[PDB]
């Protein structure tokens, strides 16, 4: 009878809000969330929802891709690494592990 | 699991109908957990469910509908009725569930149950130890407390099972609010009992010893105000309220001496506690500032040993070095004072003895 | 006049261009005056102020050794006392003043002192 | 009718009257002729 | 050109001096430039809103502890004066309290002092009487409530 | 969203059971006063002025 | 004092009512007060007592024995029972602060006793 | 201990880098230039410069752009611009709460920063107004990355907690939004020991951002932060807050005490610490008039709402939802209901500028509450769902009691004994039935006089006691409680039970993986609204 | 009667002290007692008071003084500042129902001067 919405909202993660190019969208990674403002109306544009599953393991880093821009590179505590692309959501099912005991950080 | 209940209940009603007590008693108590010995303690019952407690009441105490009823024992000889007097469901909401039937045409129903109930458990027993024990049992309301105390009066004004119950209902009286207790004691009190009552406060102010001085309390204050704001003009309108005020104007002068008395004793108690401290670590000689002679200083201030930790910027904490309490105690010492030291500092065991000009 | 020392080392990269690289109060007072050495395995700065007492920093190795307060008072003891009478004597600027002590220390194991 | 405000002064008063300013009568002045022989004038201006 | 949200002919809120000394952390500044009663901006009412926001602020012993003796007078004097007023009775005997554990050391070293905190004993020992009064008077006016039922 | 500078708002401290209202200080801002004699201190019988 | 207390709390007078209540007298003074103005003297105390409150001791005597003389005059009234309220309101301000107060007054009494001793000790010396 | 740190390069080639560690004492060391010194067995001596403004740990440290200035961030809530040509300092001071991330735009114009209330902003340069605000739910939340200023054993040492649940009202005639208690940041919170939240934002549920904020209790973001000794200031909580029938009226409570440390003066006897912070309490009851814009507006203010010879606790409010009322239950005993009069003295209304007339609330009814006293009490209260009656749950240990109150009459309708076995923790009123929390968790009838469903609840934590809590739907009607599953730390997992008013079985029995903080009920419709700690929010609906 | 107070105090005598004690020659006296029997007169007045709630018109006076010149000895004693310490705690239960028992004192002042009053309209009528 009763069922429950999907999670929405979100507290904005210390990883830094990246720039994209040209200076027009924001992305902002939450916890279970990356999503794109836009820099002039300050409305959202898209919002990536992140599925998160193992008690505490949180989002550690995000980064653009810096060989090509409109990718991202999103990666857990433990060993899961994103590379969807904003403006559309083409990477959320797919993440890649990486076999670590915990992964600390990462920088691309 | 309603209906299992509602089996028993059948079956109790066939043990009624049949009046065979004794099964019905039994079953009680399997249902509660003939002989029926006790626990010695008031708290330690186990705990039973609400059904049960209003059939409990539901078929010991009964009701006269003639537009306003009578509460009656059925069974006036009952370990059932002294185990709910012993474990307090005996309350007003409990016997109006136990009674929504024949009751909820009728009005001033806690008025009406307050007055009769007390009354009931004291026909019950004339020792009324089932009444003291109701007392220190059962959440009270002030018509039954009042009740109560009417009771007691009625009893006195093997003897003292009364007297601490008339010591319990004080404070419960005390504890519940102003408006119940002059609404209540005005109803259920004449204007004599409560001369009796206020009879029976002197002798627990008078006796105690607050007129009575030392080289030869806010639970009383508010029964004996109560009661005079519940009489008012209407009852009395002699010398017997100028010696009372006599009196109380003698207690309270005692209990403002009590008040002075009370800040000049706690201060200078705790100024000798600390300076018990500070005068052991300087006989350790730890060289603190101490006073000398037998009178208070001006400021009952005492040193205290310097702490080992340090608050840094912005809010953290460090260790002191022992250089900065070096310095901070070379601000404790003063301008002169003679500092002996010892053969045994020399040979590196003692430490030194220091008597320095008092400041 | 904040009693404040600052130390600048010339900015990496482009020339002429100077940067506060630390700063530290040292004295008490203000730091009316100071001077250099460097030499015979020895970079010093002596900084005397108000205060009375010159600080020596170390120059090549600052950030890296403690610094050193010399005494202010001076380095002869200015105290002399006759013991047979018990005065003790101290002279400054023209004025010689002479304390009597009129006890030992036995009898003193406050009011008294 | 309630006791709004009011005041007193150093004689039995005689005559009283509130005067307007003009265009939408707002009070200027209120003059108390009083059995002592004086004209109290108070002034209020916005 | 005016930001939005702000007066347009451009009036911004000045700051008085004490409410400058106050914001940027300079207590001692604050409370004398306040509590100078010869001054013409003197006011009992700016006095409790800046020793409020001084108990808020963790800062009112801060205040209080780098004093001298005529200005401990001077706070002394305005305890005195303001613990009457039951409206600022409970900001007036803290400070009180900070006064006696900070200063009650010198009251033989100075003797003006010694009246000064003896003057404000004799006017607490007025001010449980006017406040055991208040409560004799408040049980009869409770009797004559309870008899109007 | 720097928030502005704001001073420190004065304490609106509770007031007795008698307030001087609004219309007791609107009453009281007829403030100046000019008292004209009468000729020979004649009592002033009615004052006046058209509507 | 009864007439000119009754005519001061009958128009409002505010000179006439404090030079009689600057100043046996008082209990006279209540006693001859009629009836229906000793609402508006509980309201006229009540608001010189908040307003000043160095004046406390003359204005409690004064409450004190009009609630003696006129009690039923006032439940009589019962409409009017605010007065008594707004007065209830003003005395629970004055008794506001009492256990910081006897904690302060202790404080304080240690000092005073210090300075007497030493004051003793100074005479005789 | 180093906190963060920026690296640029200075330049196709990569001739050198210039490093900035913000540390955790606060300082910002500058090393110039590292692969020149270390690119050379024996290297140079290498010295960094120190800048010194933030006393807490320097949460973020960038270079901007062409490297003439140095831009930071910290706890004390301003972004500061170190000149590093000259040896000045320029800074945008007072923000909303601590800048916890910096970052420049690709090109020089552009800042963004992450601001600890969960928010965003875009500044350009030079303009610092934010051209792009982008904010969220701002909750309590029990953080990943723990905090920048926990690592160097402070005075207060920040620790990642829940103490108590959010305080938040969905609000009629505008069920999309959602007024909810905040602070100045999450850390500012949290922070001294003692949640201080004294502001409201209103928050849209449709379309999740956060609208706009208020200030409800005082607060002061353009002074400093930290007191001079090092423990950051408490400002006073906003406990007890809910909204009123129409959709024009709020009532709050907010109550400050001073903290134990600052004491030390005010101990004469027996009294302790504790003891004369509790004393020195202050609980203030505000009357809010909600405008259109969702701007709030001062009516009323009482300072003193429960009192005897010192202040009383004020434990729960509620609103009549067929009138303007609000009752209020006390440590003194009595429920007092609070009705808007208008202002008028003596005839004679007091009117704003604009002409309207001033309205105020005021005491309309004081209700004594019975008391028994078997040889510490806490309230609840809640009306029904047609109005007169008024549940009151007055709260001693074991021994505890409910009074039904009338309305119109004051007089006691009636009352019931011996329902709760510990301390009340909440109870509401719906259709009929009186669902009420103590360590057991009973549905009882009063229409019927029996109680339905009673359960035992399992035994945890005193944090955990104090954090579960419940919320009723009154229009299906159904409740729904909220308990941690078993100190209280990070990875704890909350399960919400969703039951119906008439049977025993649960109706939906769902576990979350982080602890949910708060549960509302929204107005127009069926279902609930949840807020969890790693603070994101879902709806649960019928159907 | 600084010689009296000397010897009735080391023999821990109960008839003695008394004899001092119902009769500015009170201050005179203490400031000349030695200081370690001047702790044996502050352990029996406080055995008296802890044990019974009551008052003393001359014992404020005397208990107070004594706590001024001769407070500074209580370090030498460890008994009795446990003895003070339980007995401030005890006066601070007398002086929980201070305000309780000044309404008291409220009714009795009014009902008192009322029935004074009725009683005076019968010889006035």
Redesign the interface.
């Not at chain 7, 409002?12 to 000179?15: E, G, I």
């Not at chain 7, 007065?87 to 006793?113: H, P, Q, Y």
């Given at each position: 009878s009763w069922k429950v919405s999907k999670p929405m909202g979100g507290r904005m993660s210390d990883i830094d809000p990246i720039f994209s190019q040209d200076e027009r969208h924001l992305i902002i990674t939450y916890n279970t969330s990356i999503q794109v403002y836009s820099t002039e109306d300050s409305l959202l544009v898209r919002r990536i929802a992140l599925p998160l599953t193992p008690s505490a393991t949180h989002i550690v880093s995000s980064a653009l891709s810096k060989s090509n821009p409109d990718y991202l590179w999103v990666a857990c505590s433990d060993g899961r690494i994103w590379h969807i692309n904003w403006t559309s959501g083409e990477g959320v099912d797919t993440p890649s592990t990486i076999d670590t005991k915990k992964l600390l950080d990462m920088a691309v | 699991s309603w209906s299992e209940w509602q089996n028993k209940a059948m079956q109790a009603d066939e043990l009624l109908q049949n009046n065979d007590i004794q099964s019905w008693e039994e079953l009680m108590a399997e249902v509660f957990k003939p002989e029926w010995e006790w626990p010695s303690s008031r708290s330690d019952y186990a705990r039973v469910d609400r059904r049960w407690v209003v059939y409990a009441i539901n078929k010991v105490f009964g009701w006269e509908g003639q537009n306003t009823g009578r509460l009656t024992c059925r069974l006036p000889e009952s370990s059932v009725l002294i185990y709910l007097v012993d474990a307090g469901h005996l309350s007003t909401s409990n016997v109006k569930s136990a009674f929504k039937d024949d009751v909820r045409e009728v009005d001033k129903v806690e008025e009406l149950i307050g007055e009769q109930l007390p009354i009931i458990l004291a026909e019950v027993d004339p020792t009324m130890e089932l009444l003291v024990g109701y007392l220190s049992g059962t959440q009270l309301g002030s018509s039954e407390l009042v009740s109560s105390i009417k009771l007691l009066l009625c009893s006195l004004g093997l003897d003292e099972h009364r007297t601490r119950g008339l010591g319990i209902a004080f404070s419960k009286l005390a504890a519940c609010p102003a408006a119940e207790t002059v609404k209540s004691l005005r109803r259920l009190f004449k204007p004599d009992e409560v001369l009796v009552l206020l009879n029976v406060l002197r002798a627990e102010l008078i006796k105690d010893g607050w007129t009575t001085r030392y080289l030869d309390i806010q639970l009383i204050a508010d029964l004996m105000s109560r009661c005079i704001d519940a009489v008012g003009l209407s009852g009395w309108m002699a010398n017997f309220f100028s010696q009372f005020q006599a009196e109380i104007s003698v207690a309270l002068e005692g209990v403002m001496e009590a008040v002075r008395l009370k800040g000049v004793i706690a201060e200078a108690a705790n100024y000798a506690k600390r300076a018990r401290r500070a005068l052991a670590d300087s006989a350790k000689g730890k060289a603190m500032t101490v006073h000398m002679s037998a009178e208070l200083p001006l400021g009952l201030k005492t040193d205290n040993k310097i702490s080992t930790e340090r608050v840094r910027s912005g809010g953290e904490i460090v260790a002191r070095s022992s250089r900065q309490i070096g310095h901070f105690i070379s601000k404790r010492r003063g301008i002169y004072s003679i500092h002996r030291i010892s053969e045994e500092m020399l040979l590196g065991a003692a430490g030194p003895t220091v008597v320095q000009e008092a400041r | 006049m904040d009693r404040r020392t600052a130390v600048y080392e010339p900015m990496a990269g482009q020339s002429g261009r100077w940067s506060k690289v630390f700063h530290r109060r040292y004295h008490q007072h203000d730091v009316k005056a100071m001077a250099s050495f460097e030499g015979k395995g020895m970079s010093v700065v002596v900084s005397g102020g108000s205060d009375a007492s010159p600080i020596v920093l170390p120059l090549r190795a600052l950030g890296k050794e403690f610094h050193r307060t010399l005494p202010h008072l001076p380095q002869h003891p200015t105290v002399l006392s006759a013991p047979k009478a018990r005065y003790i004597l101290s002279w400054w600027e023209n004025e010689i003043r002479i304390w009597h002590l009129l006890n030992s220390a036995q009898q003193f194991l406050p009011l008294n002192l | 009718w309630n006791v709004v405000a009011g005041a007193k002064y150093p004689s039995p008063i005689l005559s009283l009257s509130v005067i307007t300013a003009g265009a939408s009568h707002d009070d200027r002045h209120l003059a108390v002729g009083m059995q002592s022989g004086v004209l109290s004038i108070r002034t209020r201006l916005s | 050109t005016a930001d939005p949200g702000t007066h347009p002919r451009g009036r911004r809120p000045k700051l008085k001096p004490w409410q400058k000394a106050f914001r940027q952390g300079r207590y001692a500044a604050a409370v004398d430039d306040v509590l100078n009663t010869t001054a013409p901006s003197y006011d009992p009412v700016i006095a409790l809103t800046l020793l409020t926001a001084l108990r808020h602020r963790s800062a009112l012993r801060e205040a209080l502890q780098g004093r001298d003796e005529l200005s401990v007078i001077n706070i002394l004097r305005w305890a005195g004066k303001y613990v009457a007023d039951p409206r600022y009775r409970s900001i007036c005997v803290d400070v009180a309290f900070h006064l006696i554990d900070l200063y009650a050391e010198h009251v033989g070293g100075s003797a003006e002092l010694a009246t000064q905190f003896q003057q404000l004993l004799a006017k607490v020992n007025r001010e449980v009487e006017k406040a055991e009064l208040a409560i004799v008077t408040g049980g009869m006016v409770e009797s004559l409530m309870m008899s109007v039922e | 969203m720097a928030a502005e500078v704001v001073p420190l708002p004065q304490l609106k401290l509770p007031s007795g059971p008698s307030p001087i209202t609004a219309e007791q200080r609107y009453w009281r801002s007829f403030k100046k006063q000019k008292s004209h004699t009468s000729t020979a201190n004649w009592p002033i019988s009615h004052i006046s002025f058209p509507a | 004092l009864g007439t000119v207390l009754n005519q001061a709390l009958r128009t409002?007078?505010?000179?006439l009512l404090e030079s009689c209540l600057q100043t046996l007298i008082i209990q006279n003074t209540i006693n001859r007060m009629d009836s229906s103005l000793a609402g508006t003297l509980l309201?006229?105390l009540?608001?010189r007592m908040?307003?000043r409150?160095?004046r406390?001791?003359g204005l409690?005597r004064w409450?004190?024995?009009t609630?003696?003389?006129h009690?039923?005059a006032?439940?009589t009234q019962?409409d009017l029972?605010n007065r008594?309220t707004?007065?209830?309101?003003?005395?629970?301000?004055?008794?506001?602060?009492?256990?910081?107060?006897?904690?302060?007054?202790?404080?304080?009494?240690?000092?005073?006793?210090?300075?007497k001793?030493?004051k003793?000790?100074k005479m005789?010396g | 201990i180093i906190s963060t740190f920026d690296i640029r390069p200075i330049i196709a080639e990569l001739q050198d880098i210039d490093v900035a560690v913000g540390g955790a004492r606060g300082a910002i060391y500058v090393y110039s230039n590292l692969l020149a010194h270390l690119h050379t067995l024996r290297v140079g001596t290498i010295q960094p410069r120190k800048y010194h403004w933030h006393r807490r740990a320097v949460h973020s440290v960038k270079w901007s752009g062409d490297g003439n200035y140095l831009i930071s961030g910290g706890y004390e809530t301003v972004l500061v611009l170190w000149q590093l040509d000259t040896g000045r300092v320029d800074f945008l001071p007072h923000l909303s709460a601590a800048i916890e991330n910096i970052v420049v735009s690709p090109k020089g114009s552009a800042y963004a920063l992450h601001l600890d209330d969960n928010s965003a902003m875009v500044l350009s340069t030079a303009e610092m107004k934010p051209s792009m605000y982008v904010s969220g739910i701002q909750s309590l939340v029990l953080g990943d990355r723990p905090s920048k200023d926990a690592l160097v054993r402070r005075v207060w040492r920040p620790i990642d907690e829940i103490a108590s649940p959010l305080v938040a009202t969905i609000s009629p005639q505008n069920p999309s939004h959602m007024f909810l208690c905040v602070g100045n940041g999450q850390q500012a919170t949290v922070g001294g020991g003692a949640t201080s939240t004294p502001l409201v934002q209103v928050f849209d549920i449709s379309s999740f951002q956060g609208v706009a904020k208020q200030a409800i209790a005082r607060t002061n973001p353009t002074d400093v932060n930290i007191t001079s000794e090092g423990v950051p200031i408490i400002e006073p909580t906003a406990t007890k807050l809910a909204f009123s029938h129409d959709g024009k009226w709020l009532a709050s409570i907010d109550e400050w005490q001073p903290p134990e440390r600052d004491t030390e003066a005010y101990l004469t006897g027996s009294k302790t610490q504790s003891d004369a912070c509790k004393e020195r309490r202050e609980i203030y009851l505000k009357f809010w008039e909600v405008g259109a814009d969702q701007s709030l507006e001062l009516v009323t203010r009482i300072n003193d709402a429960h009192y005897t010879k010192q202040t009383e606790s004020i434990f729960d409010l509620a609103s009549d939802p067929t009138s303007a009322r609000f009752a209020t239950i006390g440590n003194d005993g009595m429920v007092r209901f609070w009705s808007p009069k208008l202002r008028k003295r003596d005839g004679l209304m007091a009117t704003r500028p604009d002409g309207q007339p001033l309205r105020s609330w005021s005491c309309s009814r004081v209700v004594p509450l019975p008391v028994h006293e078997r040889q510490p009490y806490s309230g609840a209260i809640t009306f029904s769902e047609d109005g007169s009656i008024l549940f009151a749950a007055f709260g001693p240990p074991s021994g505890a009691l409910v009074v039904a109150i009338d309305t119109q009459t004051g007089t006691v309708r009636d009352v019931v004994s011996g329902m709760f076995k510990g301390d009340i923790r909440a109870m509401k009123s719906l259709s009929s039935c009186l669902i009420m929390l103590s360590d057991d968790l009973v549905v009882y009838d009063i229409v019927s006089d029996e109680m339905l469903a009673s359960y035992t609840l399992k035994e945890t934590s005193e944090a955990a006691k104090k954090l579960t809590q419940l919320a009723v739907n009154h229009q299906s009607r159904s409740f729904a409680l909220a308990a941690p599953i078993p100190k209280l730390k990070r990875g704890t997992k909350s399960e919400l039970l969703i039951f119906n008013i008439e049977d025993e079985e649960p109706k939906l029995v769902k576990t979350f993986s982080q602890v949910i903080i708060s549960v509302c009920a929204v107005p127009s419709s069926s279902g609930f609204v949840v807020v969890d700690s790693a603070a994101q929010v879902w709806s649960i609906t019928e159907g």
């Open positions: - | - | - | - | - | - | 409002d007078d505010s000179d309201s006229k009540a608001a908040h307003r409150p160095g406390a001791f409690m409450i004190q024995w609630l003696v003389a009690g039923g006032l439940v019962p029972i008594l707004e007065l209830s309101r003003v005395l629970e301000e004055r008794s506001r602060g009492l256990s910081s107060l006897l904690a302060l007054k202790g404080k304080l009494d240690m000092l005073d006793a210090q300075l001793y030493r003793a000790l005789a | -």
